[PDB]
Amino acid sequence: IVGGKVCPKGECPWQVLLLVNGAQLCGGTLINTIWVVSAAHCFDKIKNWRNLIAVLGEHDLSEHDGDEQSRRVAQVIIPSTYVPGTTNHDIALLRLHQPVVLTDHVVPLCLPERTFSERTLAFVRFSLVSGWGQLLDRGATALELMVLNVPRLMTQDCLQQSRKVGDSPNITEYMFCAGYSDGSKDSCKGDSGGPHATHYRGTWYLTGIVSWGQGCATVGHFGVYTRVSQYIEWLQKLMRSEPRPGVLLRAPFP
C-alpha cells in the first residue's frame, strides 16, 4: 500500500495473510469461518500446494501476540475462464482445512448479494484497500498492516483519465478502476488478493480484490480490482459443494 496509514490492530479483522513455505505470498478476505476470497494470479507459480497457509488476526509480522490463527488451505478454486499470466477473472476461493475461531481480531467481511452490490455498493465512492505490500514502488514491504481509502471510477472515466501507453490490457466487465493518477496512493503487487471493502449503513462488504496495475502508484495509472459482484453466484454454489481430492480446483465459470 502506497500513501496510506497503519490499520489500527483489530480494525481490518477480515484481512488474511497468505504464506507459501512461510514466505509472504498474497492477501485475502475471510467471508465466513471456512472460506477466504483471494486473487487467482497469487497461485500461478505454486509448486507444492501443501505449504500454503492462511493467517487471520495478523497485524505485525515481526511479533507473535497470540491473536494470530494459522490454517492450512485445503482447496484453491479458480474459474475455468482465468488464464495464468493474464488479467481477466482474477479471483480464487480458498477452503480452510479447519475453521478459524471468530474473536475481536478475526471477523468475516460480508460477501454481498449481486443485486445489492451492483445497484447500491457500486455507487459508494470510497472504499478501503489493505495489505502488507510495498510501501513504495521498488521499496520494502510493510511490517504492520496498512490501509488506504480509494475512490471508484466508472470504466469510461478510468480510460479517459489514464496515460496513453502501448500493450496495456483492457478493463473488462469483470474489473473496475480505483485510486489516483498522481502517483501518490495505490495498492501494490504484495497487496494482491486483498480486500477492497465498502461501507454501507454501518456494515462493510466485499466489493473488489487487489488485482493488477502497472508499477505501484505510477503517474497516469489507477489500480485495477476484480469486480466481486460478477462472481457472487459462482462463489455461493462452490461454498455449498463437497471438498474434492487435490488442492487446486478449476471450476466452470459462469
Partner: protein, 55 residues
Amino acid sequence: ICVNENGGCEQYCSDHTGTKRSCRCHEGYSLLADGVSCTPTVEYPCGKIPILEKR
C-alpha cells in the same frame, strides 16, 4: 423499488409484484419490525468491527 435508495433497506432488497418490496439480511442478522433495519443475532456478525462497536 429496490433500484432507488436500496428500497430503503439497510441490507438486501427483493422486488415483488407491483409496489411490494421485501428487505432481507445477511446470515447472523435479523430484520426488525420496521421491515428495513438489520440487527446482529450473533457475537461476531460479518462486516462489523468489534473494537469500534464496543467503543
